[PDB]
Design a protein around this ligand. Structure first.
Ligand SMILES: [Zn+2]
Ligand SMILES: [Zn+2]
Ligand SMILES: [Zn+2]
Ligand SMILES: [Zn+2]
Ligand SMILES: [Zn+2]
Lengths: 375, 376
């Protein structure tokens, strides 16, 4: 089949930089209407969202994704234009080729094939599609999930089509993701000429014992699904530039990518306790961009593995590593949720691409998941 | 009580000798002291004027050292009286160079005149070593004069550097030495990457952490009766460009030692490298050393200066090595014993720079007392 490729190219050619959908959701609704998918627009702010649903009864199998793509940067740095999808060297190049329009196209064609085979299949098939997953994402999937929860329209199995493969399609699926908690610390000292240290307080020096403690701390020990919670400093700056001045303050930016084994509250409490135990005097701003989520190994992960083994001939590893996805919202309404897509090697980069041969394989995988959950 | 010191101070202050311009101060000094047997040698090095004035041919040689340059005044409207129109007001003499250090130079000239008058066949020799660039780059000042004196084996037994040393009352402190300064520019190497993949990055903040702590906690030496412990301080630390989801690739750290004679440049470097290397830090380190510590232990010169201050000022002087440095760091190489002694340093390089009027004849009587205890 070449329908998946054709659809992917059609989507890629629409310059849907966040939050502009460029009529991608209209295209998808109108294509799926033929096969009984009802369309419901759920627009909020400047974001377009759509809930497409075939069927009325459980089990409900949902594909979730996003039509928006990240900015291209200057087109002249690309080998071919980012919204003029190109085949070259066994790859399809364009912004959104990996993240994540090829997945969308592959699921749509999987539904078409599946429903042609099984027009009386049990349950429901839905798509949950946003035009802002790559930006602030405050008027996107999160708001759709709230709508669905409030009306008791829950999901049994959800596949988020983000790119998850490492090197071969199907080598990796995500069954959860870390959350993210960030701190902006400003340690206070007292500026002065360096040769008169008794008139100054060096915030580098006051911070040092806490810095070491922080970087050596074991926050948790991870578990079967998650690595240990990870603390990293991104930025540190203190001084005026003069080499004969003791700084008056020191700024430190840090982040946690945390598992289910730690909480936002507990991490913050422990950081303050380490600072306070060393007598550090400080200001601290905290922000949290998302919460961890997890699906235990079970039916969904087993079905996905089986479909991958049939199509791709490889064992799919479960993982929670990397960044996050809109699964962080959807898990609240989904009994089981995974992420499954092509290689993420080129996401958000110039000359983003997917291997051509992986395109019909990914569609086949999705169709195999549908057949196992609904046929 | 003599009024000559104050009048000479005013004469000097009135000359706007912003570095390196002498404005004839050294001509004035040479001409005046020629009357009492000081021979003059001018040592012009580039843009800088220097003089070696000397009376006598034998040891002991007592030298006063100083500088006729002054720092800039800044906007002149910000002064309560014009910086080169010395003024007497509220018990103080105001003007640029009143404290740093034209009063000292005046007071030593008039001490020479009074001392020589009372002791016309004193032993030894008296000298002045004066530069027009102590405040600027000073590449052509005292250090080059010292090199000429050392090359010709014209050495000094006792030197008084007339920089202001009083903290409050004239005579409260004498400097008998200074710290040296050793600076490092440390670049800690890591490997940039997205923060969510730390195993693919190397975070230089994290690799440096244990070494940072050890460096900041280190006791480099115990001090001694003349110096505080060697002092290590981090002046700057910078890594990253503001992205909160990126592990930076390198970290810049600048630090400094103000170190005594209890530690050496090489020894401090070695210990720093050893601490970095024990913790497995990967780095580049560029060193700079702007000067070396120097010291005159308590002995004749410090004794005489304390005796003179007790007699003139009624103050029990203490010895110090604190603060920055002076041209003594150069002169000590040719002077067996060297101190710094002058009036209050409270106002140096500031607007409305001044000295107490009553301190002026006192300082000159102290200098004369030193001459008499060393040479009579
Ligand atoms: Zn995506
Ligand atoms: Zn993305
Ligand atoms: Zn000065
Ligand atoms: Zn000076
Ligand atoms: Zn006498």
């Amino acid at each position: 089949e070449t329908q998946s490729l054709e659809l992917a190219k059609e989507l890629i050619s629409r310059p849907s930089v966040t939050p502009d959908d460029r009529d991608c959701q209209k295209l998808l609704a109108e294509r799926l209407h033929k096969i009984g998918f009802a369309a419901e627009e759920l627009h909020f702010g400047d974001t377009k969202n759509i809930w497409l649903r075939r069927g009325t009864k459980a089990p409900v199998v949902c594909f979730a994704g996003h039509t928006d793509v990240v900015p291209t940067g200057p087109v002249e740095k690309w080998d071919s234009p980012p919204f003029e999808p190109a085949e070259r060297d066994g790859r399809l190049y364009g912004r959104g080729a990996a993240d994540m329009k090829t997945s969308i196209a592959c699921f749509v064609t999987a539904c078409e094939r599946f429903v042609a085979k099984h027009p009386n299949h049990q349950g429901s098939i839905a798509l949950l599609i946003t035009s802002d997953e790559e930006g602030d994402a405050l008027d996107g999937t999160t708001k759709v999930v709230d709508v669905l929860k409030a009306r008791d329209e829950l999901i049994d199995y959800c596949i988020v089509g983000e790119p998850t493969a490492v090197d071969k399609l199907g080598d990796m699926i995500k069954n959860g993701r870390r959350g993210s908690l960030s701190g902006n610390l400003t340690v206070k000292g007292k500026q002065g000429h360096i040769a008169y240290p008794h008139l100054a307080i060096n915030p580098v020096h006051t911070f040092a014992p806490a810095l070491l403690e922080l970087t050596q701390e074991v926050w948790d020990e991870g578990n079967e699904y998650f690595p240990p919670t990870s603390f990293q400093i991104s930025n540190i700056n203190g001084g005026t530039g003069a080499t004969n001045v003791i700084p008056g303050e020191l700024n430190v930016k840090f982040n946690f990518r945390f598992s289910t084994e730690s909480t936002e509250a507990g991490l913050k409490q422990r950081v303050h306790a380490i600072l306070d135990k060393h007598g550090v005097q400080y200001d601290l701003q905290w922000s949290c961009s998302g919460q961890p989520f997890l699906t235990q190994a079970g039916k969904l992960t087993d079905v996905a593995r089986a479909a991958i083994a049939e199509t791709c001939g490889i064992e799919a590893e479960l993982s929670t590593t990397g960044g996050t996805s809109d699964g962080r919202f959807i898990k609240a309404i989904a009994q089981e949720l995974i992420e499954l897509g092509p290689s993420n090697a080129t996401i958000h980069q110039i000359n983003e691409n997917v291997r051509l041969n992986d395109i019909p394989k990914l569609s086949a995988v999705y169709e195999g998941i549908l057949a196992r959950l609904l046929a």
